[PDB]
Amino acid sequence: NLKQFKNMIQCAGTRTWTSYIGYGCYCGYGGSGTPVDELDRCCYTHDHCYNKAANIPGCNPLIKTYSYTCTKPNITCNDTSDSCARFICDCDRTAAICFASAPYNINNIMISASTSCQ
Amino acid sequence: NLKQFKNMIQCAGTRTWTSYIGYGCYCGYGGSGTPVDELDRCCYTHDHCYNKAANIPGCNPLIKTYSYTCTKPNITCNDTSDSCARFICDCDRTAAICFASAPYNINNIMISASTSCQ
Ligand SMILES: OC[C@H]1O[C@@H](O)[C@@H](O)[C@@H](O)[C@@H]1O
Ligand SMILES: OC[C@H]1O[C@@H](O)[C@@H](O)[C@@H](O)[C@@H]1O
Ligand SMILES: [Cl-]
Ligand SMILES: [Cl-]
Ligand code: NA
Ligand code: NA
């Protein structure tokens, strides 16, 4: 769930989730346009992942609690049987790791209303 | 913001926000397919409204705090000047009222992974 994703974010990286509340065209809620950079592409992918999670029975991305461990900076998704849990933990882990490895361009904070995301 | 939306939901209607968390193809996070009914239709519109809110400078639909009053069952958006605030309060108020007036089809809880949301 979302609380687990937040913790994964600071497990794998230096910046916490609040850092990605308003970034580029896709970090945070919804979004449109072309992801402006690597980080924004991370968010773009996560969004789609969550939206695909719905196609799984009894699976709501924001509230589904999965099993995972953090051995800072390593995240491990434990689920195998519970497909919804496993799929969503993967969405979140992938994003958390993507955020950590991607550069954070301060120039791209607050651009969603600009020509960039059109 | 989201906490305000949740309170508007119970201001305007009898059901609270949790009964919408997993309804149809669009209530709750993202979604796809055709909205199955009136209520789902409410959620579909609200999702898009939030999407558009992002096209506004310094506007994040989930954390943006606006001004509103509840005189159960009436919701009033007070903002005029703060365009982001006013827009978002409108999205939420519209959704809150829509939810209240729409029938709730228990048959449509948990269908997002079924042919229905295809
Ligand atoms: O995708 C992230 C976005 O999804 C929503 O459904 C919520 O949970 C929000 O808190 C969050 O900002
Ligand atoms: O990350 C936000 C996610 O929220 C949903 O409610 C819809 O807005 C989707 O279009 C969007 O991808
Ligand atoms: Cl397992
Ligand atoms: Cl005002
Ligand atoms: Na997004
Ligand atoms: Na939705």
What is the residue-wise DSSP string for A101-112? Answer: HS---GGGBS-T
Interface test with A, best of B40, B47, B55 (most A CBs within 10 A): B55
**Catalytic residue check, A46:** yes
Closest to B112 (Cβ–Cβ): which among A29, A47, A54?
A54
Nearest CA to ligand 1 atom 10: B62
Distance CA(B49)–CA(B30), nearest Å, equals 12
Beta strands in A31-111 (DSSP E): 68-71, 74-77
Interchain CB distance below 8 Å, B60 and A117? no
Give the gyration radius of chain A's Cα atoms. 14
Asked whether B91 and B98 are in contact (CB, 8 A), the reply is no
Beta strands in chain A (DSSP E): 68-71, 74-77
**Angle, to 10 degrees, between the axis of helix B38-53 and the axis of helix B83-101?**
170
At CB < 8 A and 24+ separation, what contacts does B68-71 make? B68/B4, B68/B8, B68/B93, B70/B7, B70/B8, B70/B11
**Catalytic residue check, A40:** no
Give the gyration radius of chain B's Cα atoms. 14
Sequence-distant (6+) residues with CB within 8 A of B13 are: B73, B96, B99, B100
Distance from CA of A58 to the nearest CA of B (A): 7
Residue A99 in tokens: 């955020």
Q: How many domains does chain A have?
A: 1
Sequence-distant (6+) residues with CB within 8 A of B102 are: B37, B38, B39, B41, B42
Distance CA(B25)–CA(A12), nearest Å, equals 32
**Domain encompassing residue B40:** 1-118
Distance CA(B43)–CA(B37), nearest Å, equals 10
B18: left (phi over 0), alpha (psi -120 to 50) or beta: alpha
Cis geometry, peptide bond prior to residue A73 (ω within 30 degrees of 0): yes
What's the DSSP call for residue B23?
B
The reply to whether ligand 1 has any atom less than 6 angstroms from the CB of B21 is: no
Asked whether B66 and B77 are in contact (CB, 8 A), the reply is yes
Residue B65 dihedral angles phi and psi, to the nearest 5°: -90, 120
Sequence-distant (6+) residues with CB within 8 A of A80 are: A86
Residue B65 in tokens: 């705090």
CATH of the domain at B113: 1.20.90.10
H/E segment holding residue B76: strand B74-77
**Angle, to 10 degrees, between the axis of helix A83-101 and the axis of helix A2-12?**
40
The reply to whether ligand 1 has any atom less than 6 angstroms from the CB of B63 is: no
Sequence-distant (6+) residues with CB within 8 A of A48 are: none
What's the DSSP call for residue B115?
G
Among all chains, which residue has been given the structure tokens 């065209």? A25
Resolution (A): 2.2
DSSP of A8-21: HHHHH-SS-GGGGS
With contacts defined as CB-CB under 8 Å, which chain A residues touch B55? 32, 112-113, 117
Q: Which residue of B has its CA nearest to A51?
A: B30
Closest to A50 (Cβ–Cβ): which among B22, B29, B60?
B29
> Where are the alpha helices (H) located in chain B, listed in sequence order?
2-12, 38-53, 83-101
Distance CA(B1)–CA(B63), nearest Å, equals 5
Asked whether A22 and A104 are in contact (CB, 8 A), the reply is no
Closest to A113 (Cβ–Cβ): which among B47, B56, B117?
B56
